[PDB]
Write a structure and sequence with these properties.
This is part of a larger assembly, with chains A, B, C, D, E and F.
Chain A (H helix, E strand, L loop, with lengths): L3 E5 L2 E5 L5 H8 L22 E4 L6 E2 L10 E3 L3 H16 L15 H9 L22 E3 L9 H10 L6 E2 L6 E2 L14 H5 L5 E3 L12 E6 L8 E7 L2 E7 L12 H5 L13 E2 L7 E2 L2 H14 L5 E5 L5 H13 L6 E2 L21 H7 L2 E5 L8 H12 L4 E5 L9 E3 L5 H8 L4 H7 L3 E6 H4 L4 H18 L9 E4 L5 H7 L6 H5 L4 E5 L17 E5 L11 E4 L9 E3 L5 E3 L13 H11 L9 H11 L15 H10 L16 H4 L4 H5 L2 H10 L1
Parallel strand pairs in A: 1-5, 15-16, 15-22, 17-18, 17-20, 18-19, 20-21, 22-23, 23-24
Antiparallel strand pairs in A: 1-2, 3-4, 3-5, 6-9, 7-8, 10-11, 11-12, 13-14, 25-26
Chain C lengths: L6 E3 L2 E3 L7
Antiparallel strand pairs in C: 1-2
Chain D lengths: L3 E6 L7 H17 L5 E5 L6 E6 L3 E6 L5 H12 L1
Helix pairs in contact in D: 1-2
The chains are: A alpha/beta, B alpha+beta, C mainly beta, D alpha+beta, E mainly alpha, F alpha/beta.
Bound molecules: iron/sulfur cluster (SF4) (4 copies) and FE2/S2 (inorganic) cluster.
């Protein structure tokens, strides 16, 4: 292929044309000092810290900007380059405030580290230091703008990755100021990432403000559970305390960003958390009791009952191990009526084929696509990183986004085809204009969010999408490898439950009111005590005591995602396993352990007593639940569409509106979100 | 001198202490300042090196002139924030005099 | 004992237990 | 009581070609003939094709489907249903 | 490469020498160190410690184990190792934790 | 001149390089690598089998009278196939010079005892065995030296936890100082101080 020969410190390296000096240095292994350069963002060249010497060149060039030329010897560690770095660091530090003892970036400060390595050891600035004002930018980010290095990283992130375009550089000269000119609240589902962006602890988190230091905190790698995207996470902990949540890089999903919910709802783990088993709802006084008492009573009731009288409702943020173990328990009791709160149509192929309930195109494939058709979604406020990927495509790989939903601000420009369901049939018949855009397209995407499927017409909308997407496949030549049907999920555990074989929806409970209910981490209130008999011995396995637990006979404390190495599968089918970061609070235990102990106290006894054996049973139920960080391919959507064609329903005339019309809606959905206080401040601010 | 506590929970003393005796947990007060909810020194693990008062950026932690504090039970030697602040208040004048005498040498 | 106030006890966590309504 | 029946397979491997052919020819017909009974088909890379039947009270039996032709797969499916 | 034994058989011969040494020593050890145990208990403890490493099959590992056993035998003979050290082998103050899954769940994690 | 930079000289470097070549060519059978550091410290690496020959040569040869054994140390490097790296430091009073001899070993690979050459080794070798677990053949009296009378481990190994596995206490029930599994009120705080940026360009390992 076409490559150029360049030298770094007299050593040859081949680089594709246009690669920057910084990128060639990275290739050879050297890491040039930088501040204003971010690989995800655009190039700025403002800091001038990456200045380097090209040999036999008179003037030092900026390594982050210069696209290398052939036969260039990049003298990284020349006297010229070192003195350039010295001068740049001097000017950076001249006006800085004396805040290192009182600065959240204390131990991680790149300014500190690069002054240490590539910086002088003495100051010769014998004048006064500039002073900048602070301005409330919202309830989440606190701005100490006196210590800005004016690097414009926050502005570039705001205008590119988020599209908010609220932040800017106002003024000129040393009196420059990076911030909103008016008193505005910087509120984006991706706002928090600015905190990690900015390299001089200027704009930092109000919640976490001043708690711990990097040399203290212990970091364990975990996967988010507050959204179906499964954004990889690092949980910073001290002495069992969860200090903060930080992004972990995963090119396919995270790309070094995380949602504000994901990074600021951790506080919910601290308030109103379960700790002790409880019993005695009949008398009305739900009191604490020993594991012996609670488990024995549950096992006794289970022995009394059986068949279709028992059932369970898994929902929200429950894990695959707990799901499979409860499924095994209820099946050994002879049931199969275990259900999930979320509603996915079961009229046709249902859950038998993963091609029906998955994002086949994959978030990575969202970049490759050319026309994406959004139906029944407000993707900005549900799976925000998916919207981030779409905006990335729109900005770089020019893409056309067409939406069949209420007009919302998806950050990018979208062709609001209509807010009606029969528009899908219009496209399928070819009556609509957007069909011409399809004919143009060589890689189409039709993405359908579970939000609409929750409607009463879920089967009708699913069949409409299926027929329309098959029509797209036949009319527009699409390679068999490329998948054009994909589904967006807003609940973390839905895909895992369906892969296991849980019955989607809760129609079974209402059709046959169970005598005993097993509410597993479900406080959605979909099944209230109004249904079921006058006494139904409802048992709650979960955490945070949301509100759904109260109206249950016995409460068994569980562990949140920060304390258990659960298996969580994201919307694209990939399996990711959390890592224990904090021991479960008080007496709380892991859910698979809980269910196995309950069974053994009962006559039944599950085959497994360890995480390895539970994972083996998981592999048994489905094989893709144990291939971690792997996206197993799906097919036979042809057969799915055949069954969908046979399925007979009709799309209502009700306008299709996404549940989340505003960030106020986004900021509280889960139990942890409801129990978190910072989210309350955010919602209050947005409301006013 | 007003009454405010000098320590601002920078935690450099904790970071440097050779024997790992200092344990600090701080939170942002109502105003927004750094203040230590708990500041605990295990005087049976401390080696009296002085590296804490060496590295305290605001001269908050200081090793007073007192040397007579033998206790009758092991649990009295685990100093806490209240005990340390009371010691500072008690020895303020002499601590201040020594600091003025020495700061030039430091 | 249980406490609505989250307590940092030595090296441990005690979250806001919250007496259940 | 055949409460649950599931088949595991993989696309790239050769042996699972028989189960894949059986699925392309019969899956839709099987669902039409038996709507209620869940016939979950799961595919994961490099897995020995297997047909797994879960009977009433949490008791299950298994039959290997490696290197079997689609007709043999159909016969096995009929046997497990019967 | 041979640390001392050529294969497993010579290592086992060395092991048998060492076991005979400990078995012969136990009476004198109990008498001299005034232990509160029977000779049968001492020899059964010797056997328990020896069996704890029966699973090892590498000749070099067996050779090193025999080195360390002869080492401790010399200590005991010379009485450098005292009564407390000798009784440490018996663990008469350690309460076992049940391996029952239910009990383990009951007791923390 | 540069007041804060350590003064440098090359005479000693040249002399040590000459002596390094000298020893290497005299003993090609065991010598495997000779290097003279910028600090001016001749450093010979020999095969484990050549310990007695090399040390006897350095002690007895007229032109090399390294009659005093300063140390017999071990450095643990778990990654390398031979974890333990025995270091010998020697001093020649006649020639005002110091030399270092280095060899490798493994848990299952004993090295010969040099007590015959320098009887000073005996106790250093006992410490090496006690702390790192390396065994020495033909040693007069190899036995633990700095560890407890019933210790079971080689503490200086990098795998060994700092606080170990066993702790001692008195128990009135048995009226003896009993040993129990280690439990700590405030566990050791391992601060992660490594800086993301690289510091010393010369020692940059290739990627
Ligand atoms: S506020 Fe921070 S991120 Fe923004 S320009 Fe200043 S230093 Fe850079
Ligand atoms: S950002 Fe500024 S005040 Fe904060 S640690 Fe770095 S240099 Fe110090
Ligand atoms: S004087 Fe004591 S408390 Fe202070 S740094 Fe030294 S050892 Fe730690
Ligand atoms: S006493 Fe001084 S060094 Fe220690 S945390 Fe407070 S300000 Fe920092
Ligand atoms: S990193 Fe190149 S000028 Fe800022």
């Amino acid at each position: 292929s076409n490559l150029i020969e360049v030298f770094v410190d007299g050593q040859s390296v081949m680089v594709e044309p246009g690669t920057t000096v910084l990128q060639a240095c990275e290739k050879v292994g050297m890491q040039i000092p930088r501040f204003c350069y971010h690989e995800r963002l655009s190039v700025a060249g403002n800091c001038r810290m990456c200045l380097v010497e090209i040999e036999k060149a008179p003037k030092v060039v900026a390594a982050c900007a210069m696209p290398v030329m052939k036969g260039w010897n990049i003298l990284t560690n020349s006297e010229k380059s070192k003195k350039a770095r010295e001068g740049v660091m001097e000017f950076l530090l001249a006006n800085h405030p004396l805040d290192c003892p009182i600065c959240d970036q204390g131990g991680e400060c790149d300014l500190q580290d690069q002054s240490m390595m590539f910086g002088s050891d003495r100051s010769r600035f014998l004048e006064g230091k500039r002073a900048v004002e602070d301005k409330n930018i919202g309830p989440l980010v606190k701005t100490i703008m006196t210590r800005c290095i004016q690097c414009t990283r926050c502005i570039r992130f705001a205008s590119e990755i988020a599209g908010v375009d609220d932040l800017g550089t106002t003024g000129r000269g040393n009196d420059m100021q990076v911030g909103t000119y008016i008193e505005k609240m910087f509120m984006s589902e991706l706002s928090g990432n600015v905190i990690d962006i900015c390299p001089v602890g200027a704009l930092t988190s109000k919640p976490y403000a001043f708690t711990a230091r990097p040399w203290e905190t212990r970091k364990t790698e975990s996967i988010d559970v507050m959204d179906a995207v499964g954004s990889n996470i690092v949980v910073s902990t001290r002495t069992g305390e969860v200090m903060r949540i930080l992004p972990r890089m995963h090119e396919d999903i995270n790309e070094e960003w995380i949602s504000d919910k994901t990074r600021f709802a951790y506080d919910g783990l601290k308030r109103q958390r379960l700790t002790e088993p409880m019993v005695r709802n009949e008398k009305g006084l739900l009191t604490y009791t020993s594991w012996e008492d609670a488990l024995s009573r549950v096992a006794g009731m289970l022995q009394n009952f059986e068949g279709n009288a028992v059932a369970a409702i898994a929902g929200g943020l429950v894990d695959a191990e707990a799901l499979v173990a409860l499924k095994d328990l209820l099946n050994k009791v002879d049931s199969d009526n275990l259900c999930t709160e979320e509603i996915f149509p079961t009229e046709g192929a249902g859950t038998d084929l993963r091609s029906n309930y998955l994002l086949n195109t994959t978030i990575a494939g969202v970049e490759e696509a050319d026309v994406v058709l959004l139906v029944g979604t407000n993707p900005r406020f549900e799976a925000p990183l998916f919207n981030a990927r779409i905006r990335k495509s729109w900005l770089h790989n020019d893409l056309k986004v067409a939406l069949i939903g209420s007009p919302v601000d998806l950050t990018y420009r979208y062709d609001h085809l209509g807010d009606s369901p029969k528009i899908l049939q219009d496209i399928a018949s070819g009556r609509h204009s957007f069909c011409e855009v399809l004919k143009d397209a060589k890689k189409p995407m039709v993405v359908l969010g579970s939000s609409a499927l929750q409607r009463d017409d879920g089967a009708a909308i699913l069949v409409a999408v299926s027929n329309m997407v098959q029509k797209i496949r036949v009319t527009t030549g699409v390679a068999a490898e490329w998948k054009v049907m994909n589904i967006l999920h807003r609940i973390a555990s839905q895909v895992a439950a369906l892969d296991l074989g849980y019955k989607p929806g809760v129609e079974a409970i209402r059709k046959n009111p169970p005598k005993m209910l097993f509410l597993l981490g479900a406080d959605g209130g979909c099944i209230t005590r109004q249904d079921l008999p006058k006494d139904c011995f409802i048992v709650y396995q979960g955490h945070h005591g949301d509100v759904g637990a109260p109206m249950a006979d016995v409460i068994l404390p569980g562990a949140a995602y920060t304390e258990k190495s659960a298996t969580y599968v994201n919307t694209e089918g990939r399996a990711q396993q959390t890592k224990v970061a904090v021991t479960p609070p008080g007496l709380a235990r892991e859910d698979w352990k809980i269910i196995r102990a309950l069974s053994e106290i009962a006559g039944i006894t599950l085959p497994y007593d360890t995480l390895d054996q539970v994972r083996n049973r998981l592999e048994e139920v489905s094989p893709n639940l144990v291939r971690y960080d792997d996206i197993e391919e799906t097919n036979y959507f042809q057969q799915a569409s055949e069954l969908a064609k046979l399925v007979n329903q009709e799309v209502l005339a009700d306008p299709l509106v996404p549940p989340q019309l505003t960030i106020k809606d986004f900021y509280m959905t889960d139990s942890i979100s409801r129990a978190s206080q910072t989210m309350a401040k955010c919602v209050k601010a947005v409301t006013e | 001198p007003s009454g405010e506590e000098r320590c601002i929970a920078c935690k450099l003393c904790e970071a440097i202490c050779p024997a790992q005796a200092i344990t600090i947990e701080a939170e942002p007060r109502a105003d927004g300042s750094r203040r230590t909810t708990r500041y605990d020194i295990d005087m049976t693990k401390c080696i009296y090196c002085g590296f804490c008062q060496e590295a305290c950026p605001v001269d908050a932690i200081v090793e007073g002139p007192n040397f007579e504090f033998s206790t009758e039970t092991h649990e009295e030697l685990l100093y806490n924030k209240e005990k340390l602040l009371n010691n500072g208040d008690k020895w303020e004048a002499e601590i201040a005099a020594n600091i003025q005498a020495d700061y030039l040498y430091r | 004992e249980p406490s609505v106030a989250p307590t940092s006890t030595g090296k441990t966590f005690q979250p806001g237990s919250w007496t259940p309504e | 009581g055949l409460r649950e029946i599931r088949v595991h397979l993989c696309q790239r491997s050769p042996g699972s070609q028989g189960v894949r052919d059986f699925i392309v020819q019969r899956y839709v017909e099987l669902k039409k003939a038996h709507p209620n009974l869940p016939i979950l088909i799961r595919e994961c890379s490099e897995v020995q094709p297997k047909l797994w039947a879960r009977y009433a009270f949490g008791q299950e039996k298994t039959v290997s489907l490696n290197n079997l032709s689609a007709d043999e797969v159909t016969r096995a499916m009929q046997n497990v249903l019967s | 490469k041979p640390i001392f034994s050529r294969d497993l058989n010579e290592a086992k011969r060395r092991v048998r020498e060492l076991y005979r040494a400990w078995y012969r020593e136990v009476p004198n050890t109990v008498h001299l160190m005034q232990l509160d145990i029977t000779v049968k208990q001492g020899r059964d403890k010797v056997r328990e410690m020896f069996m704890k490493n029966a699973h090892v099959t590498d000749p070099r590992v067996v050779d090193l184990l025999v080195i360390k056993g002869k080492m401790e035998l010399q200590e005991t003979i010379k009485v450098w190792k005292q009564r407390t050290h000798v009784m440490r082998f018996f663990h008469e103050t350690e309460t076992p934790r049940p391996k029952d899954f239910l009990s383990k769940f009951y007791m923390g994690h | 001149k540069r007041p804060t930079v350590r003064p440098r000289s090359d005479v000693t470097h040249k002399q040590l390089s000459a002596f390094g070549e000298y020893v290497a060519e005299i003993l090609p059978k065991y010598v495997q690598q000779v290097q003279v550091s910028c600090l001016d410290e001749l450093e010979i690496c020999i095969h484990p089998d050549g310990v007695i020959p090399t040390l006897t040569f350095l002690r007895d040869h007229t032109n090399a009278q390294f009659k005093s054994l300063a140390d017999l140390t071990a450095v643990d490097v778990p990654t390398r196939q031979n974890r333990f790296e025995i270091v010998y430091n020697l001093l020649s009073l006649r020639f005002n010079s110091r030399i270092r001899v280095k060899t490798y070993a493994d848990e299952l690979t004993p090295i010969d005892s040099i007590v015959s050459v320098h009887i000073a080794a005996n106790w250093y070798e006992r410490e090496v065995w006690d702390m790192f677990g390396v065994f020495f053949f033909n040693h007069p009296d190899l036995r633990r030296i700095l560890t407890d009378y019933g210790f079971e481990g080689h503490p200086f190994r990098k795998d060994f936890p700092l606080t170990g596995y066993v702790e001692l206490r008195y128990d009135d029930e048995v009226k003896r100082v009993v040993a129990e599994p280690v439990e700590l009120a405030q566990e050791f705080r391992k601060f992660d101080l490594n800086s993301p940026w690289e510091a010393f360009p010369a020692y940059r390992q290739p990627p």
